[PDB]
Amino acid sequence: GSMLDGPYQPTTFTPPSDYWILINSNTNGVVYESTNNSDFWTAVIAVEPHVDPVDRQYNVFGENKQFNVRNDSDKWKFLEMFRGSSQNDFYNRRTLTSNTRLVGILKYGGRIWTFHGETPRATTDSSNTANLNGISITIHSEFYIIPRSQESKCNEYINNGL
Numbered sequence: 736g737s738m739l740d741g742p743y744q745p746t747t748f749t750p751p752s753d754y755w756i757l758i759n760s761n762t763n764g765v766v767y768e769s770t771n772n773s774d775f776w777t778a779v780i781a782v783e784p785h786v787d788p789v790d791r792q793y794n795v796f797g798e799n800k801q802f803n804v805r806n807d808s809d810k811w812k813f814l815e816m817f818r819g820s821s822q823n824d825f826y827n828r829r830t831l832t833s834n835t836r837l838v839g840i841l842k843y844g845g846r847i848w849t850f851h852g853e854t855p856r857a858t859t860d861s862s863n864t865a866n867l868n869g870i871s872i873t874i875h876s877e878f879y880i881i882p883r884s885q886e887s888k889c890n891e892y893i894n895n896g897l
């Protein structure tokens with residue numbers, strides 16, 4: 736393969752450990768939905784530039800939800816919405832403000848890692864789970880696969896683009 740392997744078309748799958756999934760977001764709305772149905776639900780919402788605070792409807796994990804969103808940047812903003820238990824409300828856990836429209840997720844070392852902050856200085860952070868292998872993802876845009884060992888490149892792509 737290539738080190739940067741893709742693009743792959745939208746699908747649902749169980750990500751392999753130790754590869755970055757790099758998603759080229761092409762629109763507003765749900766970029767991906769990821770859960771193991773027990774303790775980990777993350778959905779990322781894309782919010783186009785210059786959106787004043789507004790309540791929008793999104794379907795996530797087959798549930799209509801209303802999220803208040805805003806973006807006061809020229810860049811796109813990606814909202815990580817999380818719940819760690821089925822009955823809890825989703826909350827906005829992390830954001831990534833980005834000119835490149837690339838969003839990253841990785842299973843590595845018992846945890847899920849994602850990029851947050853603001854390009855070109857976006858950085859990674861981890862999220863815990865007691866069922867890492869059970870996490871599946873439905874990705875609604877094209878994506879790429881890059882080994883964790885080449886995170887340096889992944890970071891470059893997240894921060895400066897393809």
Ligand SMILES: CC(=O)N[C@@H]1[C@@H](O[C@@H]2O[C@H](CO)[C@H](O)[C@H](O)[C@H]2O[C@@H]2O[C@@H](C)[C@@H](O)[C@@H](O)[C@@H]2O)[C@H](O)[C@@H](CO)O[C@H]1O
Nearest residue numbers: 841843844848849857858859860861883884885886887890
């Ligand atoms: C110390 C370490 O290995 N950190 C890993 C993370 O990689 C770091 O990511 C931060 C942003 O949050 C910085 O970019 C930092 O430079 C990164 O460390 C560099 O790259 C990593 C992959 C290693 O090669 C390290 O030697 C190098 O300095 C990484 O994001 C997470 C999740 O994969 O694991 C951390 O251990």
